[model samples]
Target chain A: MSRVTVLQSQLPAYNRLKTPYESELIATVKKLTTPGKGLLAADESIGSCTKRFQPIGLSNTEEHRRQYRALMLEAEGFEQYISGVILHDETVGQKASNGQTFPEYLTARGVVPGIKTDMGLCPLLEGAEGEQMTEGLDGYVKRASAYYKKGCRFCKWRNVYKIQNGTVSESAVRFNAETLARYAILSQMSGLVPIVEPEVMIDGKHDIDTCQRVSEHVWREVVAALQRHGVIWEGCLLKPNMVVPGAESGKTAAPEQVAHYTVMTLARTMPAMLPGVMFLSGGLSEVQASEYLNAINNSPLPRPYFLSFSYARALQSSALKAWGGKESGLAAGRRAFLHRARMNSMAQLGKYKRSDDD
Target chain B: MSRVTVLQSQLPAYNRLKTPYESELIATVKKLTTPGKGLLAADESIGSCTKRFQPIGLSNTEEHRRQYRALMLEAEGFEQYISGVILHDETVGQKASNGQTFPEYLTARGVVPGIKTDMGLCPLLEGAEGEQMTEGLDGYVKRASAYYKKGCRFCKWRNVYKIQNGTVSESAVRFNAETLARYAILSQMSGLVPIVEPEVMIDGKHDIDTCQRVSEHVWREVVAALQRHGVIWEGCLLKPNMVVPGAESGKTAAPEQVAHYTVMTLARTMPAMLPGVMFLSGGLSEVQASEYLNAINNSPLPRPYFLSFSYARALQSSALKAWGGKESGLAAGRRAFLHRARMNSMAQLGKYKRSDDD
Candidate 1:
């Protein structure tokens, strides 16, 4: 007999692309062994989108933007393992391959559709020096409702702030937690699942212990804020950044250690009732991301949420190069996309073979 | 030279009934107390409303409700001491003596208007048996925007849970913290100043130490959550329950002890830049609350938030009986209300005489 049973079925029936009771929803949307069982991080904010296009041969014009999104949507059998796709506000209502709305295209398949709700970054004047704030929730409910009608089952809001010089600024941590919790509450009422994300950035020169301590405060605060906002616990997902050393740091911990620290921190902080946890692949190569996630899934603990992936570069880095805006690159692009997803899928099962790293 | 000087000229232009600002507009709402000021909480939740009506032989129905609220809304010269009026949703929209909404009525009289948004209760499950969660955040963005449209410039969301047997569950503590931040972020974005309230219930059978420990966790989690949520530090209020013994316990701490603990805990947890601290009365008698507030204001530490009252019963208990449900009793009710407000007003200035307690 399991003593860890919740009194009520804490599972929320509301979903973005599926009805509440589709048991296979997890298998279809989150179980990574299945092909297309990962996420596509096309939900980058306007600023991030600008950055991505600036590096490519693209002008970042509206037409170019539509074409890029169309490529992802029209990709053949894209629904396999691609459990969901997160969209910016503009993309969600855009047209798809078969003339259906972009949201309808995903829902028509087995994929879940989500939205990025935060407007962008706002500077916290009194925050710990240099920490940035996430905006966009001012009219979240009305916007969420409209999105729900257009078929978004889940919403994502990111509050990204980096820890610097080992001093955890009280202002940065406080603001992020509150923002995520409010997002979850508003999403639930709109009948959409919320992907509550607070990513402690890996942009600084901080060490592993710095990451751990800050990660502890970050998760503790995020979970606490969720409860205060009256968010339905079972209805949301937590999309956290992996606890990795700063991008410029020379001391990189083993994947095993990263998994150990991340899981331990979450066990201590995350509410047990949340349905799933999809990690953001911050500053990780595809193989590194896979190994870290695999190690976490394999770690020993009361792993509350389903450990899964919500990666951007981890999914698209290889694929984008293959496509290179060439019609002849379609097959190659799809293959690269599937390959990277396969590595993550194996990771999801904790059975990823690192031999492919060679 | 005081290094802590702020541009006082930048105080937010708040009105009891003005239109809410855009979500992007950022600045701290002036503290409820400016030298001789503080909020008067006329906003009682429904359960408290029922209790107040019971003693007056008036049912808490719509018509009786209107008459009772009318008396408080029309309280003569209350603006002398009450700088803000925390209102329930109904009261925010309720028509007053001049057929204006209560918020408008208060604004015309120079009082800032705040709305209470938390939905009644949520079950805690494990820790303090029967501890209830605060709601009203299901679609907070929409609700907050509507309140802003109705003339509310600040908002309140209360999460009441308890600590018993000296066992504080981190989950419950974190939950409240997360919710407060989320609500605060939502309020700020909708152009309403947030009075982030997490009221630890005084209904337990614990001693003063337990109260202090719980209060510590409350502030710790609250500050921690606010930091993570990226909330603007200045544009908010924290209306916390004071550190005090259980209401029905065998013994209660002296007012001085309660005051010491309350101020100490806040000083340790709240950031110095926060504009003000508006405290919840939390089942305390009017005398006890005023005395404690006065003690806190007199404490030694540099104040984090402006010490002030955002009290319901502390401002209403005397008036409840004075009115006793008769229309002819309105004058006496107003006098009682004014007396309660005046005492709290004096306390905000740290000039409240303890001799007034008897």
Candidate 2:
């Protein structure tokens, strides 16, 4: 007889999140995903920020990260394109250089404030090889209640799936899909719009066809779980990785090809009732991300939900490089952030041009 | 906006059970479902036993319950018909008059020992009115591991679904089914066969027709989740309530009619690889439970699994009445227990006769 100790906490809670009604959720979701508006995914974990900062020779300090985020929040006219900003816990709690809490400051401006609620990915216990499950669900009720009281109106939880020769096992897919559903329901109950991101990582040698097939399968599972959990479809938003080839795959598809695959996959899997789908610029350059979004918008596919962008590196990498963490570089950094934001906003409407960046 | 906090532990664990391999699980399941053998469900929860005791003018006590189970286990030739006995956690550790642990004594008599792992049913949070989700998954890994080490070869988790006005919500069904799947997977990983039970209650005024339809829907969802969680069908057993009219319906189907509906539902939803299905005699008299089993086995419909019994009150009610917790009544109780065991044993083979009870 093996002595296995399964924690009660490891099991799914039988209670549903009890907060926002369907109408409130629907309105919040619609406002966040309004036409030509998208989220700025600045919710990189503290550990992940080290990599983003090292590239620009900036040290990983709480103050440095705070200063950087404050600079972005203080950017004039930033809300013109970015409807919301997803912040890490640290960022959300911090004040701008002028002393306003980030959440209150963002709300006062036109941009809604959201938080990244996941604890971060950990090795899946006894799971498939190379797969991971996100943590941070423990004591979420208290956390979400506090965040809401503090002025945040939405939140994000990112779960990633990898593709290899059967790398993303059925167990991994269902487990992650169910987790996303639970998170969304909990967020909705707390009156926060849940930006459900089930990311299919692009780290294999698989082709675009493989990527599209896997992404579609994952999305189908996610949507089914959401329905099972009774999530108000109009109240939730999806942040999915665009259907694209693996980084290691030698071939790159044209923007039209990318657009066709991405839009087709969502059309086949996502419900028309869902308010919007924001694309993650996984491994894509800013120009490529904008081009792909514009192409997707231009495609004649039937999509009831708005197609937009929730980019991290694609929006921040250029801004980070330009900022260089020095007082003198703040202007250049703000300009860089605003430029990508504007380009993606136009792409959301199918009107971005390569020459626009120039 | 209402603020809700969601916990990370409420998500399904990415870990698979690492104990029993496929072959071990399959072998254990086949042995329990061996031809002409069925489980004796002696695993009633402590609180539920009050109703059984109240009518007999007896107090619910640890010693009384222990003595009654001891008498059943000690019945001469009980092993001839009973292949496994499901016990409550408290009963699993107690010994017979001859001073042997219940599990050890059962094993010595060629009877496998099983456990009821659920913490009992509770109101499902934010679910449809009167719906329930089973608790006890919180720390199941540790409990299961300990149970296995203590001589348990299998475990049972009962999830109940309620029917009212054709309003068995999809959310409640899916939630309970997924919970059952999670429990099954965890049991298998600990080298114990999982007796998966998703029971639809018979408390309403619904007819057998509604019972059949609802059971089929619930079974389909359960089977789908079992597959999604990668439960080894060959290592699993199902304990479902037989299709019958609700207690208040003022209607009862003939044995033949009951058999047809129950067998047809299982055939449509259960996979061929599942080894066996034992009927739960919910709200049925002792005679009716046996008659239904005989009729079901006698049906011409093709069944891939061994149709058997895992009855609770239907098997024990008479025996309990005979024993009445008196030392002098032990002989009569044993006789009653043996009679039900043998009758059900015959029913498993489609050879039971109604006159045999006389």
Candidate 3:
């Protein structure tokens, strides 16, 4: 407010100026991207929770959600491998077994807590037919203020772009990229580090080369927008989908080739000041995610940032399946989560082998 | 407001949505860019007016500026060459000899009336060592609405970026481009066509090739930002500097070479939907501007739009020098302005013989 007051008479507004929390924000980002550690994306929405729970015949009740999330966060020695856990509003305020809020619970265990802030997406007006823009910026400042007050030190917003019919229209690309950049500004204003994610989806029959080309375009536009909005690269992380063949392509690249394409696209596009590229699993299976992450770290190309994971299903599928509404099942879930966590930790260091998972 | 109310229930807001005046805005832009006609940039601010008036021993006052502007817009047959006359706020409300406001005066003669809306430039906080952002967005909406009601059909904002020792910077390029885009949004909201000007100044020892590279980068980013902000390519014009050797560069390119570089850059970057590329003189002499424009039109390369001029000093220098602030001298001023306007018009159509100016 004081800075705004001082600048009101300076013929310029304070919109694109660096926020006062820049140093604190940078520190939070660095802490989350520490080597050999990654994130557990436990930030499933109520609808997402319903999808996962229905498979296990578990009711999508608040109590069950808390219990399920608690199993992963409280897993024995899981924090040793995880630096952060992105949570939903339900879990941010919900208590752990120790009676602490999830953010407080995670904080006490040396893990940073982050919240998902994007509301969803809708048909983008005036974009090439069938493109969309993310919603949720309407109450962004207010929502961010509450999240920061609740002990969260970071936030994430995902804007998805699809490689449809061999092209993501120019307007759609810039619309999503600009949305991510504007979201970063408000996230930082509330003292939270922004995990700027522009995820190009895997729903098409695009080849790995096409995916890399599209991702390169999206990444370049996103980087330019972030700089335009004055988002501090040191105070943010990139949470993008890894460059790979589309799910429907019926094609596969070895983890090394996937790693090469992913790093190569980012190298040509991303700002070097970004502390990390924490990837969304984007429907990759658990074993596949770990193997690819390991290959990414072992790539002959230089690693840009701590190339790591902020995975949802890949980090929690086994744990969720092992839990069957029992104390014994809870113990089994804990063990399952710990194994997966340790697997990714080793992957983060380029030390994982396929036989080890077996 | 009705549109916003309707979208309030939708997932998105009105920010990036098409404006209600999209049709009218597009119509206005196309009308202003009619072939063989360019714009008279009479929208110089008080400081700029001072600069031009100081050399003429004329006092910088509201009455004198209106008189000076009247000499150009009021000249016999000058409107045949100029499709539009951009005005300052002072002149927008001021009256001509026929008791009509400047906008009304222009409207009666079939020429579009426009205003300059940008306040100026300021140091861009958090940018490279020494870069700047354009100011005057604080009350953009209010100012634009007033101009629209005053019968102004278009508006302009000039954002300058210097070609320094070697660079214009990533952040600075994005910042200025984004500003231009945002300004376009508000201008369209007020039913005014935005002449989005991002002037890359010729202030370095850089070669024509270097200028083309920087212009390409800047133009690409600007086009992307406009699309991101939902600015209709049909509703706005681009006013950018030509890709010529820098003013301080000892080396010079032929007019044909300069036109080749300028058109080459735009063909690669400018959106095909755009109606025109109205160039700023940027310290080029009247003859130089007209000759370069002629070469641009005659280039073997296909043009991206109605590549034309929206020049200030180049159009007015001779006129101002001919005026001694008197009735007889005023007639000379009008003759000088008409000659310059007709020269540029002939250049716009690629029919100007260099010997004709002599």
Candidate 4:
């Protein structure tokens, strides 16, 4: 076994900047994103809204969108399993039926209000044909300040880049990593914990090690830029992409493959000063995502952070399917949401299964 | 002793999204911010401009300010030792005496062009006293695009917060971390590398450990946020304050102590993927700053980065005094500037001394 030594002076510079909410947010995030307790991501970007409505024969109108979000936020005891709700800028300003802002309502429901801060990906100057560059960061500090005023205590920004045929470029990695640090500092300055995520989109023909290497590359640069910029580690959250095979790969890796890859990646790249690791949903199904998370959590590796999930579709696909845009969907949606949350929570404990409920 | 392990696998992810500029910039920064080689931080905010003229009795009119910066950019072979020069928005746009833009002039001299992107720091809401935030992040992506168009390839931002007694608020750390990450993302999107800086002010009566702790907090959150946003690590540079006691303290830390603390702090907080670290000369004198840097380079600890200086005062203080508000003093100013640069260059080799020839 490798030698293990606990650092006594863990991030003294960081400790000096601790806030009342620092430990609270870290603990909550660790719990929420822990192997099984992935976030129930109701916070959809506006573009994503159109896709959700495209197959439903529904016009993506503001009112309909508002109602859908309201339904999700109103689910009783959202706090029990759901950790936070990621919100678009529009949703942050949107209100529940009773007139409270979505963020306010989420806060009252005991779910942390998280905002999607990335402007979205654009074409890089030399980026790959399928790879995208995250945009809209130029004036993020001002926008994040407004979000904080609207009651958000944590912010989320994403960088989605891809690897294909072993043709990954250094430009994309460096750009994403530096940009993530910029966002982290902006969030801290606004009194909000930022969810730092640089996702290597697993939408290619790569294998498991490919995913793991790409994730590590993504994180290595990300952590470097953050340290360079002087962001407080203990007060922030990390939302990372799990290491796994590509979605369209001929072979899919097992949970153990994921566990070994993730543990190794975290040990090498994720600093112990980091409070938690919340994996992005990527393209994983509910059960697959949970199992992968559980495996990583239970691996024999000495982990630095509390492994968890900040999943979007993995947490809500079932709920959305159960709702199917109908009035009768509320009960099914709530039940589906609760079931998914419970299973993920159990996954955090490494005690989950595909058929387990309650 | 820590038994380091390097599991070299063909994880294509490691090579994924790597920026072409990563290694080159790292080499450059390592040579630049070395033991004696410090950054000549020509990037002065508007407020700092007024302060420079306050002693000169010249009202800081815009034209006068522009003319002064134009003079610095016009200096001879400035690139011989000055690796990079940070420019404020106005200076970046201003033209030199020969009708070339300031950025063009700097580039001709082989100095990499950098811009100050943060609008300014604002009062933290219900903030602890002296806590300030970074601004201009609302539409930073757009702004960075414009800056890149104007010839800047790197960007810098400053986030500052004070600490007193024993209470370090979350408001200060959280706000800066998020904003910095946002800016970092935008800079990369616009094709400029980011120099993320969150500084602990040296104005208070805090001890070295307090500075160390707060600086760590600042860097941790910044890194976490950067990872989330997807900044490529190797292409960027970190401009951070040297961990030191408050300026007002009756006891100033020795140069060796400061070096040890600063390097140790970074060892504890900084990630290895980062390419370069450019020390910010917040309040250090020229000789003292150089000495501390030398000590750090000579230390036995694993200094992961190419440690160098991104200094404003250390480079320009003597020059400014020699200039002493007279056109006749221009040669003196140039001599002073060259002397400092040469001295710093020697320092990069850990060979700088007080008795070095002028």
Candidate 5:
């Protein structure tokens, strides 16, 4: 009798679509997940940047945005704890005070620069409630090539979804997964590592169980799509929401419980071949984000990938508050930014000190 | 030490959304898979009906359409082999020669009635290349309720995909699966069993192995979505394309090979709880369809569901030709239809013979 049970083995194996940039992409992903290092996400689009600036009494003008981004990117010694920085489209091409492009400045500081690539959210076609499809793939190939030429070594596309009344529509989850896979393949083709982020929103009254269920469902679909697109798993990084209770749940999980749920979900759905999983600290305060990251690292579960952070607000909210739109406030902003960055960096290594919470 | 390590057991289980129709839906699904029984797919829409008639001398008038459907539904002893007949929207509401409603007529003869619920296909947004999103979910709950009142014990929604160069885009597969799940949940809520059909088209140059891979992937997603939507697997039937080489592959697998691939794919991806699997004969000739189905039943693989047919062209092509759009052709049409129906019934039991092919 023939010993081969699966006919798939008799046929040719699926091509994993390795590109010339495979090695560089894998190396870049590894660098971002290096011990005691995490991503600095300053990649807010113009609209979101405007929202951030509005409260700070800062204009949304090009100069103000550029100055603020420059302040964060060029902060003294950020590269030691921040292995990479994600840039908004316009920010990557802007010049710093020394006349160097933001990308060039970041590269000189040994911090890899990444770009935000998703166009934003739009309603799903057939009207699946509480769901939005992420745009920006219409001209992604061309845009990715431009970003690659402009010195970006990696890219991020955020696809947002939410849990409502105990469920996230399967349509929305599948749509986001498919879009993320398309973006990842194109990013790889352009020689940039893709940070595949499908953020399940934290705005609901659900508990940690709902969060864990939905996150696992989303991650499984995303991983399947990536494999279907023949994406090289080693050349990609996953930026997922850390499973936790919904913001309005009127209840919160302990950091250990949060870590246990998040790591267990990842262990079930994420492939061992993938290099890393960096978390999005949605709706979490700075301290909460760092504590959660530390707890996740402290989980006893066997994790296949490096657990790290790609947080935006949790990394910069305090710094942005300290800056208060004044150039003189830059010092305080840098100090706040460095403190949070170093805290998260320590959390990534499971060595963060809660005594510093004071 | 606690025997259970994970905390999920303490939390509420993912809701399966039990409806008042649960028992009825499960019972009806089981009835359709009665031993040596299968479905007769007469649910061609007006456009498709017109295409079938245009080849003959028949006009695509409402009278011609109604009369043709009446002939098949009222055929002598069709209920002996056909457990059910899928009706187009219009046909489901029409009257037979005796002025009895079509559903009433079918039920009197011990045949269940089913309806096709999908509005049809539309192009997928962001240009995912030759992909389509199945429409008709707008107010699907209301539509399903009306169908159930009209006596549809089961409903089918077809979400089509095509293979090219070895793979279908993941977006299309995921999209189809989501739509099917939504339809299914609504169907069960209204007391109708859902026939979830994700038909991977056989119009490429790919081999049986490629077809097997794509079908397996599609089935996996469909099953996942059904579970995610909390649709009871026992209350649903899967109508899938049998894994076969592309129609234009210039190569065809033997019946044993085709059966092996199809059975293996389903066994791996389909849940043991799903009640049955009825295959759509996409582009298969009458003989090939029956032979392959018989070979599938002959396979030694253990299946958890009744494997059967929900074929259209493979069951109706010769009958349509024999009918020739004339009242005098009814006898020939019934004979031709019955021959194929019985052949398939035999195939369902692994007793179909090559001598019956002629």
Candidate 6:
């Protein structure tokens, strides 16, 4: 029922994104959203680690970064809850203690390996209120090829946006969405599925209704750009922010309300046949992520795609806090990781039972 | 105070399109939109000529096409009202009766030589209402380089869109707008100014309010996409469809309301650095196009950019009908072309006095 169609034109032109990797790409996406599992996003770059470490009392030295990765990947049963693990360029090349590279180690454990492909944000304007757009297309295809050889089956690229007033500017939404689409096309050309993320920031005083509205525009622009770039929906998964009130809004909606708004935004924007939507934890805490995802699974609104999580901080910050970058606390770190994984695994299937603290 | 600025990244990337032709590009754009003059769009391709000639009982043979181009280009004293002439590839290579190629002849006559660069549209969907996107980047850079060598000072690439009900879907607008941006970037890299056109179709029963709303979206998406791709706003001219009710709406708006809505849309969507907005006629009658353009020039709203015409059929169909594909009728064809040229030339200066028949 899902066929790839290319229409011949009344003019002289042919598509270049029509490649032979459709089935492999589709299969990879379906595998990542297998029942009771989602992605584990450990793909923070060295630049990102500088901030993620400051709060954990860990030096951002190379070996400590490697040790942190080993603490997560070496956990015995994480693959039971995580269907895939996204990596940094550094982790893709660094070897596990068993003499396998991180991507190889993940692949051997039947976990899909993905990489971060975006460079970062650049300004589209100049003042303090100036907007930014993402840039990374310099040799994007070649980088994907190298990642493929190193065992990356997918790639993740994020574009960041800020909401002004109650609405995000139409300019930033379309600009960043288009760049995210281009990043998706080059990923598939090199046999990697792309996890498109357009994160509208939560650092505003906007309420839940405004968050839902802005999410709608961002989602619509990105989906349209992806279709234009010939990125097969079957071949990609979305990693987007949950629709929630902005951080300074002085009010938090119930998990059920957050679930309703989040899924409603997707229902109104995303086309049918997208394989899955794996949400980022954003700045949500460990319990809120699982609780909200569970609420989403049981919502009255229709969810046409497979839905789950692709969290970084919600899954790892507690583990980092317990481990303190020390080998002696590796067991405690792995236990912290497994407990959160189990929560989300249950949440994905509508089976999570929230504790009083959660 | 208008300066070309590039922001340094907090990541590992430099730009590829920050070429050194910024000032030259800006100057060429200013030259194209000269006061009391506008572009003569003789850029119909052979494939387009096939449709154009059939209605006049002329077979689209090669020599007939050449004769048509010559009839327009060879009109004596036409340069006073025409700042530039856009050519099909055939005309660019073919010589006038004198010993010069069309572009060479035009350049000698103080006209900018423009070429059409879009290959055609490919399907983004497959039904009767299926959307489409433009494609030409297959060696697009090399094509622009060759056109520059052939005396071209600018290039035009158009992407098409259609409105359904009262709304153009978000996907088609953003998709086509982003493609137009890429075309503009390639043009600047090759030392040619780019004429970016996103022609939303005028075939529905939509009212002027809907047209205004849709133009707002198309214009916003395009300006955003251009900025995202690092297109120098100074290096491009927008060749856009006028904000008018759809053909089947059964209500023709007054030229003044059309001017208000059109300029209002631009004021809200376009950023400050864009050099000009030269509009396409989109099947408006010759008199109507001139009347509306005149009203735009005298519009009460603030237009932050230079405004003019890049009309094709509105400026050429009368001449083609007069010539009737015969060499003996060349003088009549020349008169028809000159008459319309002078009307638009006057319209650009807000000085057109409509005839009783018009």
TM-score of each: 0.55, 0.70, 0.55, 0.54, 0.55, 0.56
Q: How much lDDT does each candidate structure score?
A: 0.73, 0.84, 0.83, 0.72, 0.84, 0.83
User: What is the Å distance of residue B58 in model 1 from its true position?
Assistant: 1.4
Query: Listing every candidate in turn, what is its Cα RMSD in Å to the true structure after a full C-alpha superposition?
Result: 10.9, 10.1, 12.9, 10.8, 10.4, 12.9
Cα lDDT of model 1 by residue, A200-224, tens digit: 8888777887788888888898887
lDDT of 3 at B177: 86
- What is the C-alpha lDDT profile of model 2 across A37-137, one tens digit per residue? 88898888778889888888889999999987876888899999999999989887899977889998998887788888887776543346677777665
lDDT of 6 by residue, A235-255 (tens): 888999999999998988899
Per-residue C-alpha lDDT of model 1 across residues B20-132, encoded as one tens digit per residue: 45332333266364767778776666666677788788888766777877777787787888777778787776788778988888778878788877776655432344555
By TM-score, how accurate is candidate 2?
0.70
Candidate 6: residue A241 Cα off by (Å): 1.0
Residues B130-163, candidate 6, lDDT per residue (tens digit)? 5667767546667888999999989898888777
Docking class of 4: incorrect
Candidate 6, residue B153: the lDDT equals 89
Identify the runs in model 1 with alpha carbons over 4 angstroms from their true place.
A1-358, B1-28, B124-133, B136-138, B300-305, B351-358
Of candidate 4 chain B, the 10-residue stretch with the lowest lDDT total is B4-13
Query: Could you tell me the TM-score of chain A in candidate 2?
Result: 0.93
On residues B1-358, what C-alpha lDDT tens digit does candidate 3 reach at each position? 3121222212223335457898898788878888899999988787777877888788888888888888887888888899998898888989989999989999999999999998877665444545667767545677899888889989999988866655566667876887788788778877889999988888888888778888888889999878767777788899989989988889767899988999999899987888898999976889999999999999988676888999999999899889866667888898888899999999999998899786
Per-residue error for B268 in candidate 1, Å, reads 2.5
Error of 5 at B233 (Å): 1.0
- Which pairs of residues have clashing backbones in candidate 5? none
Error of 1 at A286 (Å): 20
Model 2 superposed RMSD (Cα): 10.1
The best candidate in terms of TM-score? 2
